[PDB]
PDB file of C-alpha atoms in Angstrom:
ATOM      1  CA  UNK A   1     -15.802 -10.289  14.721  1.00 60.57           C
ATOM      2  CA  UNK A   2     -19.723 -10.584  14.139  1.00 58.07           C
ATOM      3  CA  UNK A   3     -21.736 -12.762  16.723  1.00 62.47           C
ATOM      4  CA  UNK A   4     -20.450 -14.825  19.467  1.00 64.58           C
ATOM      5  CA  UNK A   5     -16.578 -14.990  20.428  1.00 65.75           C
ATOM      6  CA  UNK A   6     -15.881 -16.435  23.088  1.00 65.35           C
ATOM      7  CA  UNK A   7     -13.124 -14.059  24.666  1.00 64.16           C
ATOM      8  CA  UNK A   8      -9.898 -12.523  23.204  1.00 61.03           C
ATOM      9  CA  UNK A   9      -7.568 -10.804  25.566  1.00 60.16           C
ATOM     10  CA  UNK A  10      -4.887  -9.117  24.675  1.00 61.49           C
ATOM     11  CA  UNK A  11      -2.148  -7.045  26.373  1.00 61.35           C
ATOM     12  CA  UNK A  12       1.188  -5.166  25.181  1.00 61.20           C
ATOM     13  CA  UNK A  13       2.775  -2.051  24.612  1.00 61.80           C
ATOM     14  CA  UNK A  14       1.359   0.436  23.217  1.00 61.54           C
ATOM     15  CA  UNK A  15       1.576   4.185  22.289  1.00 63.52           C
ATOM     16  CA  UNK A  16      -1.412   5.435  23.048  1.00 59.15           C
ATOM     17  CA  UNK A  17      -2.082   9.081  21.837  1.00 56.90           C
ATOM     18  CA  UNK A  18      -5.764  10.342  22.878  1.00 60.95           C
ATOM     19  CA  UNK A  19      -6.751  12.365  20.218  1.00 63.07           C
ATOM     20  CA  UNK A  20     -10.285  13.288  20.341  1.00 65.20           C
ATOM     21  CA  UNK A  21     -11.669  13.372  23.709  1.00 64.58           C
ATOM     22  CA  UNK A  22     -15.632  13.548  22.516  1.00 66.23           C
ATOM     23  CA  UNK A  23     -17.213  13.334  19.008  1.00 65.85           C
ATOM     24  CA  UNK A  24     -15.773  16.634  17.179  1.00 63.41           C
ATOM     25  CA  UNK A  25     -14.214  17.163  20.471  1.00 64.82           C
ATOM     26  CA  UNK A  26     -10.044  17.627  20.731  1.00 63.77           C
ATOM     27  CA  UNK A  27      -8.437  15.683  23.566  1.00 62.97           C
ATOM     28  CA  UNK A  28      -6.068  17.389  25.979  1.00 66.20           C
ATOM     29  CA  UNK A  29      -2.852  15.371  26.611  1.00 67.23           C
ATOM     30  CA  UNK A  30      -2.564  14.884  22.759  1.00 64.93           C
ATOM     31  CA  UNK A  31       0.775  13.554  23.540  1.00 63.70           C
ATOM     32  CA  UNK A  32       1.901  10.266  22.388  1.00 66.02           C
ATOM     33  CA  UNK A  33       3.156   8.214  25.379  1.00 63.64           C
ATOM     34  CA  UNK A  34       3.782   4.510  25.758  1.00 64.62           C
ATOM     35  CA  UNK A  35       0.688   2.955  27.467  1.00 61.52           C
ATOM     36  CA  UNK A  36       0.448  -0.750  28.034  1.00 57.49           C
ATOM     37  CA  UNK A  37      -2.776  -1.890  26.658  1.00 58.03           C
ATOM     38  CA  UNK A  38      -4.567  -4.249  28.597  1.00 61.56           C
ATOM     39  CA  UNK A  39      -7.930  -5.955  27.001  1.00 61.34           C
ATOM     40  CA  UNK A  40     -10.184  -8.193  29.236  1.00 60.91           C
ATOM     41  CA  UNK A  41     -13.893  -8.430  29.466  1.00 61.61           C
ATOM     42  CA  UNK A  42     -14.444  -6.350  26.368  1.00 59.39           C
ATOM     43  CA  UNK A  43     -12.465  -3.406  28.194  1.00 56.59           C
ATOM     44  CA  UNK A  44      -9.703  -1.859  27.236  1.00 56.29           C
ATOM     45  CA  UNK A  45      -7.212  -0.822  29.621  1.00 56.22           C
ATOM     46  CA  UNK A  46      -3.862   1.281  29.814  1.00 53.10           C
ATOM     47  CA  UNK A  47      -0.936   0.834  32.164  1.00 55.01           C
ATOM     48  CA  UNK A  48       2.389   2.285  32.684  1.00 53.94           C
ATOM     49  CA  UNK A  49       4.093  -1.452  31.721  1.00 51.68           C
ATOM     50  CA  UNK A  50       3.713  -4.758  31.915  1.00 52.08           C
ATOM     51  CA  UNK A  51       5.011  -3.939  35.687  1.00 53.14           C
ATOM     52  CA  UNK A  52       1.954  -1.590  36.298  1.00 54.73           C
ATOM     53  CA  UNK A  53      -0.399  -4.286  34.263  1.00 51.14           C
ATOM     54  CA  UNK A  54       1.074  -7.042  36.607  1.00 50.32           C
ATOM     55  CA  UNK A  55       0.210  -4.930  39.498  1.00 47.47           C
ATOM     56  CA  UNK A  56      -2.719  -3.901  38.991  1.00 45.50           C
ATOM     57  CA  UNK A  57      -1.618  -0.189  38.886  1.00 47.86           C
ATOM     58  CA  UNK A  58      -3.268   2.589  36.341  1.00 47.30           C
ATOM     59  CA  UNK A  59      -1.351   4.180  34.145  1.00 46.55           C
ATOM     60  CA  UNK A  60      -2.443   7.764  35.931  1.00 46.27           C
ATOM     61  CA  UNK A  61      -5.750   5.753  37.390  1.00 44.21           C
ATOM     62  CA  UNK A  62      -7.437   5.850  33.982  1.00 47.48           C
ATOM     63  CA  UNK A  63     -10.226   3.152  33.863  1.00 48.22           C
ATOM     64  CA  UNK A  64     -10.593   1.052  30.663  1.00 48.40           C
ATOM     65  CA  UNK A  65     -12.511   2.102  28.468  1.00 50.37           C
ATOM     66  CA  UNK A  66     -15.295   0.195  27.031  1.00 48.98           C
ATOM     67  CA  UNK A  67     -15.155  -1.748  23.449  1.00 47.81           C
ATOM     68  CA  UNK A  68     -19.285  -1.625  23.101  1.00 48.52           C
ATOM     69  CA  UNK A  69     -19.993   0.037  19.860  1.00 48.66           C
ATOM     70  CA  UNK A  70     -16.248   1.049  19.482  1.00 50.26           C
ATOM     71  CA  UNK A  71     -14.281   0.726  16.499  1.00 49.34           C
ATOM     72  CA  UNK A  72     -11.230  -0.280  15.355  1.00 50.18           C
ATOM     73  CA  UNK A  73      -9.700   0.285  12.234  1.00 53.16           C
ATOM     74  CA  UNK A  74      -5.738   0.997  10.920  1.00 52.13           C
ATOM     75  CA  UNK A  75      -4.035   4.103  10.787  1.00 48.53           C
ATOM     76  CA  UNK A  76      -4.189   4.136   7.233  1.00 49.67           C
ATOM     77  CA  UNK A  77      -2.368   7.685   7.012  1.00 52.26           C
ATOM     78  CA  UNK A  78       0.144   8.028   9.552  1.00 53.50           C
ATOM     79  CA  UNK A  79       3.116   9.043   7.650  1.00 52.86           C
ATOM     80  CA  UNK A  80       5.907   8.221   9.880  1.00 55.47           C
ATOM     81  CA  UNK A  81       5.159   5.633  12.212  1.00 58.16           C
ATOM     82  CA  UNK A  82       4.510   2.260  11.266  1.00 60.65           C
ATOM     83  CA  UNK A  83       1.759  -1.031  12.520  1.00 59.91           C
ATOM     84  CA  UNK A  84      -0.641   1.728  13.876  1.00 57.46           C
ATOM     85  CA  UNK A  85      -3.960   1.748  13.757  1.00 55.16           C
ATOM     86  CA  UNK A  86      -7.056   4.094  14.865  1.00 57.08           C
ATOM     87  CA  UNK A  87      -9.209   3.089  17.779  1.00 58.88           C
ATOM     88  CA  UNK A  88     -12.878   5.238  17.674  1.00 59.17           C
ATOM     89  CA  UNK A  89     -14.990   4.624  20.703  1.00 56.72           C
ATOM     90  CA  UNK A  90     -18.668   5.236  20.402  1.00 57.73           C
ATOM     91  CA  UNK A  91     -18.217   8.353  23.185  1.00 56.67           C
ATOM     92  CA  UNK A  92     -16.185   9.525  20.313  1.00 58.63           C
ATOM     93  CA  UNK A  93     -12.972   8.846  21.914  1.00 58.99           C
ATOM     94  CA  UNK A  94     -10.467   7.961  19.281  1.00 61.33           C
ATOM     95  CA  UNK A  95      -7.072   6.892  20.353  1.00 59.62           C
ATOM     96  CA  UNK A  96      -3.350   5.897  18.452  1.00 63.12           C
ATOM     97  CA  UNK A  97      -2.071   2.691  19.060  1.00 62.98           C
ATOM     98  CA  UNK A  98       1.360   1.573  17.452  1.00 64.28           C
ATOM     99  CA  UNK A  99       1.748  -1.868  17.683  1.00 63.53           C
ATOM    100  CA  UNK A 100       5.639  -3.790  17.516  1.00 62.43           C
ATOM    101  CA  UNK A 101       4.803  -4.753  13.618  1.00 63.19           C
ATOM    102  CA  UNK A 102       2.189  -5.758  11.363  1.00 64.56           C
ATOM    103  CA  UNK A 103       1.360  -8.729  14.004  1.00 64.66           C
ATOM    104  CA  UNK A 104       0.895  -7.485  17.237  1.00 61.91           C
ATOM    105  CA  UNK A 105      -1.088  -4.145  15.513  1.00 63.88           C
ATOM    106  CA  UNK A 106      -3.347  -6.522  13.236  1.00 62.54           C
ATOM    107  CA  UNK A 107      -3.628  -8.750  16.256  1.00 62.06           C
ATOM    108  CA  UNK A 108      -4.803  -6.325  18.420  1.00 62.22           C
ATOM    109  CA  UNK A 109      -7.699  -5.281  16.025  1.00 60.40           C
ATOM    110  CA  UNK A 110      -8.549  -8.919  15.793  1.00 62.53           C
ATOM    111  CA  UNK A 111      -8.835  -8.692  19.334  1.00 63.13           C
ATOM    112  CA  UNK A 112      -9.996  -5.134  20.116  1.00 64.47           C
ATOM    113  CA  UNK A 113     -12.659  -6.431  17.137  1.00 67.12           C
ATOM    114  CA  UNK A 114     -13.152  -9.460  19.392  1.00 67.03           C
ATOM    115  CA  UNK A 115     -13.692  -7.063  22.350  1.00 67.06           C
ATOM    116  CA  UNK A 116     -16.429  -5.155  20.566  1.00 65.69           C
ATOM    117  CA  UNK A 117     -18.215  -7.300  19.140  1.00 70.83           C
ATOM    118  CA  UNK A 118     -18.660  -9.556  22.036  1.00 69.01           C
ATOM    119  CA  UNK A 119     -19.090  -6.507  24.608  1.00 70.66           C
ATOM    120  CA  UNK A 120     -18.448  -5.770  28.024  1.00 70.68           C
ATOM    121  CA  UNK A 121     -20.125  -8.838  29.855  1.00 70.58           C
ATOM    122  CA  UNK A 122     -20.766  -8.160  33.206  1.00 71.08           C
ATOM    123  CA  UNK A 123     -22.114 -10.150  36.259  1.00 67.28           C
TER     124      UNK A 123
END
């Protein structure tokens, strides 16, 4: 994106692996786990699955990470997984997600980007 962007929502099963919890800060979990990514209002939420997404049940109670000034790029390095993109927040939070294919992935980015630009609009 760049400017404008009405609102691009996206939610699906992704493998979120919290690597960095902050600038030059190594996360804790750092364990590959199936976390349902739920983008909305310009916020990326994490849930167990679509069953917890429709039930508004948070994976572990983690809130949605604001994509305000966040970066979203492909994971050009991961020599094992496919269709994976690295998401670097502004708070120094870096997460690793694995799409189902080049589509889901590319799309995400297109979405995550449509969210970043737009921003976490509130009222």
